[PDB]
Structures are given as structure tokens and as C-alpha cells.
Design a binder for this molecule. Structure first.
Ligand SMILES: Nc1ncnc2c(CN3C[C@H](CSCCCCO)[C@@H](O)C3)c[nH]c12
Ligand SMILES: Nc1ncnc2c(CN3C[C@H](CSCCCCO)[C@@H](O)C3)c[nH]c12
Lengths: 230, 230
């Protein structure tokens, strides 16, 4: 059968995923993560939260691919908005991702760039198109854009402005670029889906605490609607 | 037989390793890395460069463990010095590592800390003690201390001061903490060995360009002397 990996960063991002699928799961620990393995609509679904940030998410994605043999990875979670048109609860899919905190400018490399890699990492056009189709049929707004990932929770106007000017990012989070990077290295289709929890400004901690649960649920519900069409 | 993973970040860090072992290697590509597999003194050695930074090094380490089944990981490369007593070419082993660019302080977490993890990641006391024994027998200076890892090349007095005050780091680099983190998650002994290439200050790019080859060779030679005793 088809094997689909489903990832969040925090436990709160996968709790609604496990509940919404509503099937039994076997828990399999590996590399400090717990993988929930279930069968849903004739597909094997493997659900896990990575824990926060780039190292955690790189490890979990690599484990999913190498140890569980998943054929697609769908990431669902929350994100900070960098643009006026992405408001609390709104959904976006990443067309490209960047590691916004990478800085080898001492050697005149562009910010975000590492030798033998690239600034922007692409996701699956096919999965992004599926998301768009579903969103239109459900009459849900869905934006497509660049997501910036780094190992800092962004809560300042100055950092937002940098992300917009340097990378033209629409949202910020801490895991998407690493998940997409790993998938691309192994030829595995990847979709990164996020629901806005905050505006990545001085009020972001507050907003995040308020909206984590609801925004996570919104993302999870949409991810399920995608899996229903795969 | 015993399987030993040997990692550098850049090709220049593993070129001397491959030459110094002086055996034939089979090249095995996986996840965008090339793994050089050889037999040396009745051990299987698997050598690779990860490419620069935390995501690259997390992926390569995870691959080494999950796909090649290595039982120990030794990292060899260069680093920026944060302390007066670590000069160009000097060797150190990391007793602990930290991800110095992790910042969840918006939620009053200490810098370097991520929920469900820890600020400091430990390495193998047994391998560090072997390194110390060998260094003493060869009449080579070998320091032990905290190494700070992040996704920026550090070349400023201000950032050095932060690393010293916040984490009491002795050296800075971009991969050690991720390698040690992965190893710890999988119960695999890890040793991170670095030779100083620069002082992580405004002159660091210059110094790095000058000393990369020599410092890499110094680290590689010491790593080989460790493998000779394993
Ligand atoms: N403003 C923001 N900056 C960076 N990432 C995010 C995100 C996305 N994720 C939410 C979470 C933020 S860190 C939460 C710490 C909770 C207290 O322990 C990470 O997994 C990244 C939402 N808003 C953000
Ligand atoms: N000053 C420094 N800051 C951070 N890392 C390092 C290192 C260690 N590694 C050396 C290398 C620095 S980035 C080199 C880019 C070369 C031009 O493309 C990374 O793999 C980290 C030496 N000096 C450093």
C-alpha cells in the first residue's frame, strides 16, 4: 500500500491529526521520536511530531524516509505571518522554503546559501496543486508562497522586514525548510502546510499561545482532506 | 567487524582522512552524500563529508547510523577559537556541545534550549579519554571544552563575547552539536575533534582560507591515531 508520512513540530500540531483520522495507531519509538502507524482509507499513515527546530525536524524526516519507507511527506502546523493578507487561521502551502538564519556572508555568499546547496528548496507541485483544488472546492482561501525557516522564534518588526526584503517570504516557522530539504535529497514528494498563529512581531508570543490549538486544528483538518484525495 | 563512521563537514576535511588511511574505498551515494566505505585494521570505516551546517550534518549522521549501522561516530575538522589558549592548529575535543543560534527566549526559555531537549549535548567520555591518552603519549596539547555550533560563520568580536558569556564555549563551528545530538538519540558513541583554523573575529575569513588545509590535516592525523587504538 501507499505509505504517507505526516509531520508536525509540536505535540499540539499532531494531536488533532490523530483525532481527525480516528483510527487505531501503533506507537513505534525511534531516534527519540514516537511514530504513530495506522491504516486509513487503504493507506499506511505514519504520524509524528519532530520537536521544535531544524535539527529535530531533519532527524525525524530522515527517519521517516529511511526507517519507515514513506513515499510522500505532508507537514502540518502553524506559522507566523509576514504579509498583511495572511491573517490568523489562514492557510498557506510553501512553494519554496529557505533557511533564513544561514549566514556565510563572510565569504561573500548570499544569505541563505550554502556551498553545494541552494537558497530555495522546492516542494511538490503536484501536492500543492491538489491542495489548491481542494481549497477551491471547499471555498477555503489558500495562499501559496515562500516560507522561511530558522532556529529562532521571530517576534520583531526588524526581523520580519529582513525576511520580506531578503527572501520575499510570506510566513516564518522553524521546520519546513529542513523537512523539504531532506525530502528533496531522497526524491520524496513533500508538501508543507501551515495555518497562521501570529504575526511574528512583538506580540507573537501572546498570539501564539492564544491560537496554537485552533490554528493547528485548521491545518490538521486541511491535511486530512488532502489525504482523503491521495 | 566494528563499524566506525568518520565525518567532516567540507571535502577539504575528509581529503586528508582518505589519504592517511591509505586503503581502497567503495563510494556509495545516499541522500546527496557520498559514503566512502573501506576496511582498515580489521574495522569497517565509513567516511563522508556532510556539507556545511546543521541540517546537512544532521542528515548525514542519521544516514550513517540508520543506513550503514555504524557503532561509533568520530567527527574531524576545523573550528574557530574563542579562547586565548587555543591557537591556530591546536586540537580540542568537545566535552559538550550547544546550538548557539537557538532562540526561544520569547517564551522565557534560556538561549540554546528547546522543549523536550537540553542546552548541552554530551559526547563519549570513553572516546574523549582515549584522545587524551593518545595526546599525552604523542606529546601533543589537547584541550577539552564546550563547542558551540550554529548556522553562521562567526567573524565578530560581539558574537565571540556572547558565546563565551552565554555558554562558556571554547570553540565555534557549524556541525558538531547536530552530529552529537543525533548520536545521543540513537545511543551511539560520538567524539567531536577540531583543529583551530581562525579566531572567529573580523579576520576569520582570511585565517580560515590560509589554514583550512593544514588544520584539517592536523585533525585528520589525530583522528587516524584514535582509530589505530580502537
Ligand atoms: N513567530 C514565529 N517564529 C518562528 N516560528 C513560528 C511558528 C511555527 N512553530 C511554532 C513553534 C514556535 S516555538 C514554541 C515554544 C513554545 C513554548 O515552549 C515552532 O515549532 C515553530 C509559529 N509562529 C512562529
Ligand atoms: N569562525 C567560524 N565560525 C563558524 N564555523 C567555523 C569553522 C568550522 N567549519 C568551517 C566551515 C566554515 S564555512 C566555509 C565556507 C567556505 C567558502 O565557501 C563550516 O563547515 C564550519 C571554522 N571557523 C569557523
Amino acid at each position: 500500500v501507499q505509505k504517507i508520512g505526516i509531520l508536525g513540530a509540536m505535540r499540539e500540531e499532531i494531536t488533532p491529526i490523530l483525532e481527525l483520522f480516528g483510527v487505531d495507531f501503533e506507537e513505534i519509538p525511534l531516534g527519540g521520536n514516537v511514530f504513530h502507524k495506522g491504516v486509513y482509507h487503504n493507506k499506511e499513515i505514519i504520524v509524528a511530531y519532530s520537536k521544535i527546530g531544524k535539527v529535530h525536524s531533519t532527524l525525524t524526516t530522515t527517519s521517516m524516509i529511511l526507517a519507515f519507507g514513506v513515499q510522500k511527506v505532508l507537514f502540518s502546523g502553524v506559522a507566523g505571518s509576514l504579509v498583511k493578507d495572511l491573517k490568523i487561521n489562514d492557510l498557506l502551502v510553501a512553494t519554496q522554503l529557505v533557511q533564513h538564519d544561514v549566514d556565510l556572508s563572510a565569504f561573500d555568499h548570499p544569505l541563505g546559501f550554502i556551498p553545494e546547496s541552494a537558497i530555495f528548496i522546492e516542494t511538490s507541485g503536484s501536492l500543492n496543486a491538489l491542495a489548491k483544488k481542494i481549497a477551491n472546492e471547499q471555498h477555503i482561501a489558500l495562499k501559496e508562497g515562500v516560507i522561511a525557516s530558522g532556529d529562532q522564534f521571530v517576534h520583531s518588526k526588524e526581523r520580519k522586514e529582513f525576511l520580506v526584503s531578503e527572501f520575499k517570504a510570506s510566513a516564518v516557522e522553524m521546520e519546513g525548510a529542513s523537512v523539504a530539504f531532506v525530502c528533496q535529497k531522497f526524491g520524496v514528494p513533500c508538501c508543507v502546510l501551515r495555518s497562521i498563529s501570529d504575526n511574528a512581531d512583538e506580540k507573537a508570543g501572546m498570539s501564539f499561545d492564544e491560537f496554537l490549538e485552533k490554528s493547528a486544528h485548521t491545518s490538521a483538518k486541511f491535511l486530512k482532506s488532502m489525504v482523503d484525495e491521495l
